[PDB]
Symmetry: C5
Subunit: 310 residues, 5 copies
Amino acid sequence: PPPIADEPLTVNTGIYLIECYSLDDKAETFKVNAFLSLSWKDRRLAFDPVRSGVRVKTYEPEAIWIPEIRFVNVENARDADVVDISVSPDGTVQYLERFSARVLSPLDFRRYPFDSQTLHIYLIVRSVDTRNIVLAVDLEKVGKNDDVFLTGWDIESFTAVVKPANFALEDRLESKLDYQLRISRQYFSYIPNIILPMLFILFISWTAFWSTSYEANVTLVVSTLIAHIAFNILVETNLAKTPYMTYTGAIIFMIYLFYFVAVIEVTVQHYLKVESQPARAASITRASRIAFPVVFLLANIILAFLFFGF
Amino acid sequence: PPPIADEPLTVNTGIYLIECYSLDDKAETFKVNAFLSLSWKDRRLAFDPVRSGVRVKTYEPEAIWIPEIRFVNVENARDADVVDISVSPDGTVQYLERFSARVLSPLDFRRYPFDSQTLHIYLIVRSVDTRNIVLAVDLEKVGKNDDVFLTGWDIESFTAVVKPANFALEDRLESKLDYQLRISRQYFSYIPNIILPMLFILFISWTAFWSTSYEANVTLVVSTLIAHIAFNILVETNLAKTPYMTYTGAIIFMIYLFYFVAVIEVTVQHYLKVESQPARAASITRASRIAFPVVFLLANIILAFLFFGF
Amino acid sequence: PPPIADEPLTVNTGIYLIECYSLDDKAETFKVNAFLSLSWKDRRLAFDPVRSGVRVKTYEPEAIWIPEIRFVNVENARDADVVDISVSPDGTVQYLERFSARVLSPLDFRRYPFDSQTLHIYLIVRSVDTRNIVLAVDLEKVGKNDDVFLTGWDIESFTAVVKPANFALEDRLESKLDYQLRISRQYFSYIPNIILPMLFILFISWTAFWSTSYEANVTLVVSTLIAHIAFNILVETNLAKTPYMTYTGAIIFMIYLFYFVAVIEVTVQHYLKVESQPARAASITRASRIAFPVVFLLANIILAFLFFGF
Amino acid sequence: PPPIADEPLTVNTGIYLIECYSLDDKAETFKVNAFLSLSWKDRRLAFDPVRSGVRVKTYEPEAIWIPEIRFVNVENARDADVVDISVSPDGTVQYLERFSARVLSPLDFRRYPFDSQTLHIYLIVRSVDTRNIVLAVDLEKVGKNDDVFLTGWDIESFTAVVKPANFALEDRLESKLDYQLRISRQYFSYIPNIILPMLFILFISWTAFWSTSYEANVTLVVSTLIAHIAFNILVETNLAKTPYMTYTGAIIFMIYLFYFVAVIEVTVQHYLKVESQPARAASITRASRIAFPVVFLLANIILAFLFFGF
Amino acid sequence: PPPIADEPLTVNTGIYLIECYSLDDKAETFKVNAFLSLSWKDRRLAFDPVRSGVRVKTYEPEAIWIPEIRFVNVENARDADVVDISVSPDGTVQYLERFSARVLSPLDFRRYPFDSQTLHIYLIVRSVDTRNIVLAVDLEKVGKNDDVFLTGWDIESFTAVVKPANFALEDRLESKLDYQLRISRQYFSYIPNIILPMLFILFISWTAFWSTSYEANVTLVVSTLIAHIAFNILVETNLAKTPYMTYTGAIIFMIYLFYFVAVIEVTVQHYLKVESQPARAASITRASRIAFPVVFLLANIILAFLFFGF
């Protein structure tokens, strides 16, 4: 029994985030526990203030006609509990539920260690014999609480795109809204556990540029290559199979080349010295001591600029 | 109370994919959130346009007789919410739910890094005292949305096999349809994380073909063999126990042989040189420098052609 | 309201497997999605063909008395949806649900890489004031579909033990049936990923029988021992803590001994040669080159026969 | 509507284990699927055999007043299905459900490889205006079935503490029972996968007591230390963070010391021999060959006795 | 139908913890199973002791008006079962449910191995046409049981902040309470499995300060660096991505520097000795034997004080 009306019915939405948690980088999903605030005019049950009852009349969801508001980018059916329905004397309904769903929003990993994200929450409503249009009442839109806790993320701002996008879908039009949660990753943990350890073993790796023993250099450069494969796997594990190149995935692949040409050096250093050309051997080795660090710091500047500076 | 009819009743199906996600390569399952569109003629409740009501009459699932449409290759009971039922004046019912199930479709891993898949969604319906036949209404079949996001996969096309397959099952006939989602894997992530790293350590592995120290060569060839076992496990983990040979599983097993005959070489190089036959030692070693790379690039051409080119 | 009868009521069961999946070797459980077919005579609602209605009368589960059929070796309550109830004119009820439960069937890992299993599905029914006995109707027992897909397993045959086992349990008798799914493991994946890699590193391990350098031999035999611990863990992970000895668990423990006596050799080879007895040193070492491979191939024949040939 | 009585009402409990599974050592929880048998006298509905009906009258849970029996040490709400309610003519009710919950019982890991456990199942009932007391009817208490399968555990005995413990809790008294499942761990799997492999690498570790090469000894003692860290982690993973010392955790920490003083030896052996005191070097080394094995076998006897023998 | 009142209604809360478990350090969540005790005066149903019935009248949740008490920092909807409702003659309602939810409370990992935590449980209630205020009845607040078992944690005290915090939220005021569970981590497990093993491999690492062989020192210092990366990962795994520095994360990063300057030493020791300056070589090496242990024990005192002593 939809409210008889002369033109499209406006449903007034508003989300109040109470809890955020479990941002799954692999799955590209997060979990929200918030308030949903719906309000529409249904003159069909305007009541008479003085003639009976009180200021506002409370109802159960069964009596009133309620607009079916579905979340779009959500895995299962939104898990909600009705908190209060309050009809105003003019026939204005005040709906308020508390829902908990896990939302499916894509993430951009192009700068995975240092990146910002804009999570999306989408609300749609379908029509029957009257048209429905959703819109945000900003006073119920202040989704954030001063206690929102998203582990490993900094919460910038929860806002809503005021203008809905109205599709036509299966000989009926629907109205979609875009609630946007903007977050930036807390990169600090990565430095003392990934970045700095990865560099250290790379620096050790070419300590063999001040050595002449092949056995001790192959032990050196190779054992550090193993340690880098460990970090490479440790990072590739908590990250989805992106079709592009991540920032750490670039530098982690760059490092792979510095272990190859280092292995190439100590090998070339060896055949050369064993072939009675040590004048060339100790000449190459000495250059490496400058070339490898410089090209590295150079390529990183090239790489870093190619991602962040552009 | 099934609709009394003169011949088999046609139910007109149509799926509209809203979300795709969680393609589990190990489990061989994906998760879909879509629209189901059913439509059948039930003249038993044709209504009179002018005489009463309006153009279209809305019902609750309890009143009308609804065809029981079950998904075949699905784990648990399909999780659906009814969106709208709309009976046309001639007695045509327009059913529309929004379901979310996880579907069980086999995958072909013969070319695991670079492969295409055709996922299946099957709909069946059973008969009672009249026969039922399903068929697709292509206007409700445009399953795709311009936002379908399947991580690590490119979505080619969602179509439906228009001709149903009608089995006889337990003294009653059923009608089955085949909705087909065609996808191709986003292989790019595999190159800088598996393929290229795997090759590098293999090339380093036979840098010992330019060396004479057994100790430094056994350190070399063996330490790289360990690193390959790591990658071998890393790949065997995100992949089911296929009864055939995967493409990477072939090349990853081929690599295992190149580490064996390399270990064989440095060993043969050593007994030989220690046995006062260095004329043969440095002769073998020099050939290896050409044989191993050539046979590898050859075997890969042989292997690659044996999988993709045929 | 159980059907008044003169003697024990026979309920006629029948399972039709639609999907099989998720055989958890660690948990010793699998997941089935099948049809349950129950049929019993309840003369208490025999209806009159000509006098009224039609050939067969359809009911809702609430009206009719339905026998409570419970699955025995199942974790939670079987998750079923009723498909159709059809009472025959003589008072014969045709019940048909579609259930999905995860079943708990023990597995025998004595030949873990190459083994066959017989999964069990048990149905019980309890009595009230009349006795109930279950029995299989073979035309509804053809559980298999030509699409049953059990990853990493070959499905041999789904049959049912026709004779029920009738216990007495808590001053009431119950009737139990045994549906049996016979499967054999798809061993092919194990060879290029476990068996063959494990052997290779073992053969490399005693390439040190053609060498005299202690440093290069301890690097050899020990580094391969590490790689074997990796495979040992990799296999012990996807396998339950059986109280017996598995086939691979035997050969994987046998391999552990060949790494010990090899380490013993190179060590004995060394003290000996360092003690100015190289006549004995190079004598032992040369025998190893034959003893180790022969004893291995011998012990495997002994072991293999002890498991499969007996 | 509780049964009006003159004194505390006795509810007669009884559990019949049908399935046991999923004993999580990390979580300290197991999962049970059993029968619950309740029986109490409610004279308020004692009925007339001859005057009407039959021997026993069957009811639905809604009609009768049922005692609210809650499980104590259980995570979520016990998941039960009612099997039969049968009121005896005197007003004696025979209740029988089939439940499936996961129970939270602490475990004692003091002898983790070889240990016995007593799992607990607790039933409580709260009072209203009459007092309730639970008690076991041993004829319904034979919880075990000849098919109970607890992977990696031997089931000794399922019994019940007949005398309930009656607390006062929030101005109302409750009655608690103690059902006890006694189990002993199947230790066999641990020997060929943890214990024996751990010892082997320790014995190899001090094969360097028959060697003079520092490079080959540091390769020896250290590479085996790495393998022990692997086993140390492999065991610490499937085990909770106990506040006491486990048996394997003791011997695994003892082994850590034997790798330290071994590294200390080869180091002391070296400075000494390099310092032109080989008379002392080869004297220490020779003693190690006896000291380390003896102290080990001694400390193990000391340790083993300190845990099991006391 | 809220109770008509002259001023804000006081609801009297009280939590009785029955089970605590599953404190997820990664997720920063724990799981509680407790009693909720609500009590408010609803004179609108005061009954007449003498005139009818008995001392206390028992109701079903449907009849009475019940205050909607929601948990704040909880993932999904609190899972509760009503135990008893008992209205007093003056119109005082005694509500008691048993709930089980998983709570989301932030943890402070600044001293991760040795740390104390204060878990939070928050209760809110919203107003309608009368105001509601929650407050604790300490006789129902004794949340603890003498059986509360939180694995790997010591439970200090469960208390409640008696003064509620009353926000205004969306043109309606809410009343929030703070129940506080104070716990301290059981650090003992960490010493024999992380701390002591980590130190041992570090001490072994600079046993190369009593050695002159580069090959044996690079084997030494590097192989132990690998073992430390293992522990570093083993610890970083069971710990969230904090934006600050943990205590073990500091010392584990400090250790990384001691492996770098040690690798720097043996390298400098080598170029020097190879450059015919052994007078400086054996001079540096001898100082290291004192510098490294002292600076370590010093830096730890500095670090430890910087975290705990301040």
